[model samples]
Target: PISPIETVPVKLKPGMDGPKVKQWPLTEEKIKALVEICTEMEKEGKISKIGPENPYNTPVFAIKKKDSTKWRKLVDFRELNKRTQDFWEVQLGIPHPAGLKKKKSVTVLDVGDAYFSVPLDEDFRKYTAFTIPSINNETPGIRYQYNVLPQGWKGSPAIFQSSMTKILEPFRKQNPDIVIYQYMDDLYVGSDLEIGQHRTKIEELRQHLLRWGLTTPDKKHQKEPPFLWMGYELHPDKWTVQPIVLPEKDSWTVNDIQKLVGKLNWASQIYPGIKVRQLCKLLRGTKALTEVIPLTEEAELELAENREILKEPVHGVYYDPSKDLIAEIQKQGQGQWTYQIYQEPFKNLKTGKYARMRGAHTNDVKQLTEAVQKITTESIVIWGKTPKFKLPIQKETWETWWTEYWQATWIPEWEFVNTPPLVKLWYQLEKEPIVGAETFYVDGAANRETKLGKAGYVTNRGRQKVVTLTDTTNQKTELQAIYLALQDSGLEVNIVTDSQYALGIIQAQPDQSESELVNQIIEQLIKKEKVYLAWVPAHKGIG
Candidate 1:
């Protein structure tokens, strides 16, 4: 229940048309249910009649509920989203539960049916109109438009977040004791003091949101550890968080690739130990994936493995003297060792303090140990509580905290490789017949302006010519040879080419002219189960 702030207007992308969609067929009972719902919505002023000349048009569909036969009337907004501009929504990032002190209490509030509570602007209502089938099916149905924001709109979530931010901005500025974090409809309120005293403050904040039209349910409020937010379960007890895995399919589509990667990217922040870059590389290779794309056994296992790892609890860091090291070398009078400097950044499991390492190189373990030697004083307050200053370092607490910090911060390995020299494949021919496979020898000749290539397959009986390609680079012609072999050859194909350049380009070069063809060849290999690429030494008597 939030009112729209006029600071930013949601606009359509430039030169885009309001999408018109085909109406879906509905059962008579479901159609009657839809009619009833639409009637109620119209009477409630949630939707109103729109003219036929209106530029925007979408279809309404009825969704049947799981334990009941009731239908939920929803609009088809996928087409509309394609034409709408992406809205910039600000997110107050997820909080680290480990940074919370044991003394502090956390409260999470769920805004009920949050998106529907916000009223959409009258000006934007025309763009959200959708037509439903008349109960009789013979007559044209009413075309109703939304007066309030509807679910499924691409910008709806962002717009809602923005509105909530404006509503909470004043509360955030006035109260320094409360730590507020908002992710869409979920509000996480944290305080150092006990929850009983903070009840008044929570009520005040809740009332303000309610006044602005938010419907926060009292029963939805959560306190303390095992808090679920943004698909992650955060446990403050051990400073650990794990992903709440949802059921997924055996094979993912092109759309799934984007969705999965996006989720993983967010989870990377939640769990720093995940190797996001490696997974990103795998997803990048699927940029050209189609609906026909099937997950390889290896890819399926990788996805499953990532989900399994994410499901496991990842503990936050606490420093340890045995594991965490800092070294420092001090400059004394006449360069004598008077004092050594050691400093390192620490992540809170609850309260906060600043620990800066002075003159310590991250790569050198010696520097880390030396840096630790410089830290004569440390604070031993319980994680997420009060910070104490000017106390000598306690080995037990400091080591545990240092271990937490060390484990939480995953240092990336930076490896740079120079361009490698292209290696050629060499082969020798034999007289024995190879069973269950056909062998093709391909060669290309290049002139100043043109190139010609030939591919011929050899069988036990005799050799048959494949195809001749012309007017191309030798690399391209060799690629053409492989392409023809894939198209003509049986279940199994062995392609032998003399041009190392062609082989190397097909295998390694990502953005070359023949990359797509090479990908096709690879796909065929996976499908056929027996395609091979071999090399022959050119100008030798082998082929």
Candidate 2:
């Protein structure tokens, strides 16, 4: 062989040899197509007639390839693969999504006859031995074994991947800036530079492949958008990742359903938070991989809906951790739960301002954790801020009773001495900045009988004032008192409140606040030059 990748023999652990499988009865045309390809393979030295000294006997299947009446031959390697140890970890890592967005273009390359270039060792050739039906006159058939790497062998992909990576070392060492992803014989080269540079780099890469005796097919070189790679017909414009849709039929097999779902799953990755409940329902009904079943009416409707959604042009952008995140959590009726995390907009390239961008929604919370664990692994020095859910629990609870406690990975311990007061949530503010300073305190009270509210403020300036409020809750009036202090103080001053809810709203950012009155209070607090908010207990330290 002319390939530079040295043939490395494959070995398997001790296991029983596979029994002979009967070849499927073929029509005259199919038998002719199968025999012609086998003869061509024997001439090419990909397989050799071994007569009859073999322990393993796997079957071969033929697929109709072209209008020219040629067929592609495939082997049944499942039984043989069960006995081999594979190099599981050496394969390439599929990159994080929308690298198509990060890199401007992708050049996809497919090599011709990937595994056939590497020779199988003589010692293991018997393990790959197989028989085809007689063409002319022999009693049973001619027994043959592969001389080169065989497709459908589970270990062959890893072996081929290892070999190709070995050959691409020269190109990798030369071009550190170019991003290339290798899967078996296919390599997708992502480029951020100009197309002129890409042509040079691809030609440069092709030269190296030629030196290694590997040839890429002319038609397999795709250097444009809508490039079909990784099951996505990727369009870089607006970052719309389109799926190569599978055609629907009247009847479906479990294998057919699996193929469609596999493609749809890849499509689902294009934009996060698409809940395809009905298609998955079809998958749930399957009993065996190859079992054929008629498509139910509901299944047709589900498939039609899925196709409708996928056909529309959907643009999805990747997450930028630098931007702010709008997150929320809720537990509905003790059954439904969510942590809907929406991302902020992307910074405009030309204007240097934020622009409108789509939100990334997730249903399961663990999906976020999984995404963060992989994404948050960047090597940079910055504070990692992850938002979490805080529920209103019973008074002074979660003291390890509902379930037998398993130690959490880690977080702050719940201190009974210093945790939030019974049935109320409050954190004691650090006393560094505002200690020993004269401050004004505010509180509001509502009489249940009269339904009237009172707002009062006591100042260390020896000033105290009270105002009656007609339409407000106790917390609202309490925040109104804080608002009045901001109105009263034309200069910088400290305003403290006994209401935790009011304090939270007063200190919140625009995205965090909800009510119009709260927003007006927000405007008042911002209108003042320097306003610091603190919280005190309801019963103590008021005035």
Candidate 3:
């Protein structure tokens, strides 16, 4: 409804508060503060001599009557304001500040809603005005609506948010410099440094939340990226997908691919596609990481369009748990410093650099270096907590080992390979009175060579079974005749073959005798729901 010319540019501030664009015409304190600032600016010679163009200042507009004619717009700063992470309205692809990119640890403060309990009558009265129909002319009806979940009304997110925010108030006071925010049930807390201080604060917050009977759902379980809390993945430093578990020492079987698939989905937000088909090679005797699952073209386009909005803030900075630090602190054993460093990141924020020399105990230099990592004592990357059970098989000796290998290793491995081959089905079902389901084909030759091809038959559902037919010619035209009979059946059908001869005949001569017999077999097969053929690119090379 307005153009760029309608508003003036204004420098934005660091705080979230801004001129109430929706609720303007300032309150008394706002007006007084404004006037004081203007006066101060004047004294400081900050008030500029008006330029030649327009001298009018920021003015708000009245869109309608009763909007308070006392309207004036404050200089708009929407462009200049630091873009925020708005999980509700934004879509995928926008880069956000508080996101996985930050790689910061978080202290997920599971805040319990603060104490607030109204009497039954009072609670009922509160929603009285919102009842669907009036109870009587004078009094409102029973407010059953207020008791419902998945509420269609407003303030649901706000009501929950306020409670958590209130609970975190005292904790915030204790760690005045810590970062804290409440996105509904998500309470994100993290510190600038990876010291025990952040962990202590997280534990404190957790204890408080527990005291209020609000459990962090699956408090210790971690598998999926914490999406609802922080809209980013907790990724490993290399951005590599986690490798599937291999057979451990003296073990015979490889772990199930399905389990790894589940983990892949769990870590998808961070290391997506980790268990995709690319990893199939890893299980095929070549433990190589040469495979790649690049973002598809479509994904790349989407990300390009929304990069800014999708990014989220980092709650913790990752550290390669320093073995050096651990060793140092261990040598100085029998102190809380060594143990705390093992359990959590630690630092001496109180004293300046040369802080280590200042005598704060830590493991070795490696552990001390690890202490530099920022961790979200309040929140952890969800995948970090997933279960990794030990391998089941344990055996020694050739006979037992070979037996286990057949039963547990090789058999299961083939089963993984034999798992329903995902063949793409995208062929036109009809070539005349067109009808048939799309099916692709790959023929395994007795020689173990395989080829891909298409078929020459169409069928109307349920019209034919045993589609192969023979023609008057003494020559054999087995599959082609089957194709023709299938067409005659009038069912929706598509068929294919890996045989080049069959493909050549079907494409060049569909009405021939051989074509007819093949069509018939195809038709019967379709009728029995036992056959499916698709036209895919014929691969000449043996597979």
Candidate 4:
């Protein structure tokens, strides 16, 4: 019941120059394949002999089959498409795989020889001609062109999609519960039905397709889970879209980067906040490398973070925490504190499975941490050792643990000098020349006790300065360095610091003010002609 479709006319953009004519050499096997395919196509009324006065022509090539024993003829339409105008409106928006998973059943159907079913406009066939010689040299050469919509044409996909959309309109109106998605030749239909009921639905779909003059080979119609749609594994049990299989390592090339980025972009929707935007942007159109490009130190760190974020279980699934186990007794033990008896493993949702006191780890407290707090006069046991405790305990176990086991240690603090270090220096009356600018290394530190802060700077020209600040924080040091750099705007200056927070602020308008002095420093930066801020790791001995 299949029917041939009417061809849609193509319109070229104004000031058009036709595509260059090039006769690409074909291998013996490819030439044979082309002869067989063209002969069949002409006999089936899909193509026709053309004349020599064609205005447009495009090169053709053969794409090797998976078995490498056969090839498919594909025209290279890049040059021909440059002057072609596309005005077709898109009507099919493929549903996300996650949404499709909600249906009780799904049937995948692939339209065989989909494009050829749509015929090409008679007047436009001349623009699609390609020349080939007779196999026995019976005729010198002949131009054979498609009478139907051809593959590799720029507007072919849009045109075919529109034609198919009209065919499926009546079916859509009849079955309100059934959802159909079409991506060119690939079609996916979903309905809320069990196995027995789904059989009738599948047949209904087949009859509908037949009514519209379409055919779906039996092998391509899948009826349940394990659906491979749009390069994603749409399994009902997974609850999330995942790749069917990871691609081989050696297969990666410059062109493959875009495919990886595209896959990641699609997967990121299932796992939001994966931070793929930066990586996708970085890999877009990169031409130098072949294999996967190695990430920078910061980018590598971000990749690790995103991987961890993706490790979290999807919705409605709790992590199985009993995976890791430890022995009751270990090598050495800090003297432990007694606790009220409890049954469950202690866990802190914020800090993971480990319990914390004053933001530090406690040696022991395993079973008690896991169990809920309950007051009893029973003996407390844990880790093959039971410590004696006074009875009738009313205080919270954590409070008691901290009170008995807590001890403070002394930490040495360094004092800061108010003035710059003494060194031989020269003073310049006028602004320094811009040819060789001065480099300044700046650092800032703050302590909790006095709420005190200090910003210091050292230059290669033997100038050093330090200033004490009453109300300042660690990140303020980075801003302070920029302020110090801008102090002498007449000379070009470069400020080096290691704070991403401060650097992000400098790149964009500040969402929140760092402080009055910091904002003033930014204002000063607005007036400066040449100033650069660079980031570097702290305490690595690099300036």
Best by TM-score: 2
The best-first sequence of candidates by lDDT reads 2, 1, 4, 3
Find the 10 residues in a row with the least total lDDT in model 2: 349-358
> What lDDT does each candidate get?
0.56, 0.59, 0.33, 0.55
lDDT string, candidate 4, 289-346, tens digits: 6655655556556555666655674431111233321112111112211222212234
The per-residue C-alpha lDDT of model 3 at residue 180 equals 74
Per-residue CA lDDT of candidate 2, range 479-506, in tens?
Answer: 7787777677654667778887754543
Better of 2 and 4 by lDDT: 2
Candidate 3, residues 1-543, lDDT tens digits: the string is: 001111111222344332222223434444444445344433533232233232122222222236664322233324212322222331223333222223245655433222111011222112212111121323521111112111222223433444455656787787776777665445676555565765676777777666654555455853333343233344322122223232212211224433444444444333221224443323465233343233444533433333332233223333333221111111122111221111123421010111133222112222222322212111123212211111112222223334422222221111111112211111222334223354332232221122222223323343323322222221233244344444443344444545545554333222212243444443354354333343334465522
* Candidate 2 regions with alpha-carbon error over 4 angstroms: 18-28, 66-68, 89-94, 98-101, 135-137, 219-223, 228-233, 236-238, 241-313, 318-543
Scanning candidate 1 in windows of ten residues, the lowest lDDT window is 421-430
Model 1 agreement with the true structure over 215-295: per-residue lDDT tens digits: 667555545566664444654333455544635776556666666777765665444333344434445546555553466
Candidate 3 ranges with C-alpha deviation above 4 Å: 1-104, 109-152, 192-197, 210-232, 236-543
- Where does the lowest 10-residue lDDT sum fall in candidate 4? 347-356
Model 3 / residue 60 / CA error / Å: 45
* Per-prediction TM-score to the true structure, in the order listed: 0.48, 0.53, 0.23, 0.50
> How high is the lDDT of residue 531 in model 2?
53
True-structure RMSD for candidate 1? 18.4
